[PDB]
């Protein structure tokens with residue numbers, strides 16, 4: 498049921514999604530171990546992910562959350578990196594896409610920093626890196642991230658350096674409490690609370 502529509506680089510929508518990718522790169526405390534060493538990306542393609550059934554599943558849950566939270570879905574656009582991006586865009590998010598060992602429990606994790614999601618493209622901790630060269634910092638191989646619409650609802654705030662949401666909450670927010678430059682990360686515990694809106698194909702770029 499999924500079709501992928503290419504955006505033109507001239508399209509304002511391409512440009513605004515690219516800007517969110519590039520502008521939310523940061524340095525990571527692993528010195529690039531998981532995701533590679535880079536300050537920016539080479540964006541190769543941005544595609545809109547269109548699936549009516551998955552969209553309706555998302556908006557149905559969004560309305561339920563909204564109604565439980567004074568008509569406020571608390572919807573964000575957030576990055577998700579996973580070796581399972583291809584399954585996600587066809588079948589939707591579900592329990593198989595959860596990070597069982599995540600610091601906020603077994604849920605599906607999203608980041609404000611694109612560079613954080615980039616650390617997960619080849620698996621937890623970058624796995625063994627790219628399939629072709631076994632390099633977590635590969636500058637040749639094409640990578641993919643999702644830029645997703647995510648319903649947070651009432652989000653449980655965790656200050657810090659598939660399970661259930663905390664009672665009375667629809668998500669968890671992981672607030673950075675140490676690294677002053679890090680943006681927030683978020684966890685949802687139901688696949689229906691995220692829609693994979695854009696598929697971004699890119700390379701990390703070797704700094705000069």
Ligand SMILES: O=C1OCCN1c1ccc(-c2nc3ccccc3c(=O)[nH]2)cc1
Nearest residue numbers: 577578579594596606607608614617682
């Ligand atoms: O453990 C896994 O088995 C199935 C799939 N998976 C997985 C784990 C973590 C991530 C991931 N974890 C994050 C943690 C924090 C912030 C972003 C992310 C992010 O974009 N992705 C994605 C998928």
Ligand SMILES: [Zn+2]
Nearest residue numbers: 627630635638
């Ligand atoms: Zn490679």
